[PDB]
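Quick one, C-alpha cells below. Sequence please?
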C-alpha cells in the first residue's frame, strides 16, 4: 500500500489577468515546473509567461521547491508583456511570412 514516503502538496495561487488558477505540485517538483504547468491550464507558453512573486528575490528554474520550503498557502502571479491582451475577437493583426 501507500506508506513510508509522503509528499506535501502546495497550493500555488497564480493570479493572471484572465483569472486566478489553483496549482498543486509536490515539493519535489522544480520551480520551473510551475511555469510549464500553468500552460497546461492556461494554454500559455512559458516563454510569454514570467514567473514572479517568489520568496527570495528571483528564483531560478534550476531550483527545487523543497529548497525554498514554501508555506502551505502560496500566492504567485504571471506577467505576459509580449503576449497580447485577452479579447474575444480582434481584427488588427494579419498573417504573413514573418518571424515571431
Amino acid at each position: 500500500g501507500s506508506s513510508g514516503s509522503s509528499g506535501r502538496m502546495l497550493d500555488f495561487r497564480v493570479e493572471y489577468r484572465d483569472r486566478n488558477v489553483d496549482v498543486v505540485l509536490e515539493d519535489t517538483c522544480t520551480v520551473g515546473e510551475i511555469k510549464q504547468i500553468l500552460e497546461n491550464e492556461l494554454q500559455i507558453p512559458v516563454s510569454k509567461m514570467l514567473l514572479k512573486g517568489w520568496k527570495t528575490g528571483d528564483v531560478e528554474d534550476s531550483t527545487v521547491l523543497k529548497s525554498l520550503h514554501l508555506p502551505k498557502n502560496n500566492s504567485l502571479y504571471v506577467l505576459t508583456p509580449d503576449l497580447p491582451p485577452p479579447s474575444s475577437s480582434s481584427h488588427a493583426g494579419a498573417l504573413q511570412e514573418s518571424l515571431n
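The CA atoms of residues 82 and 100 lie 11 Å apart. The first helix runs from residue 31 to 42.
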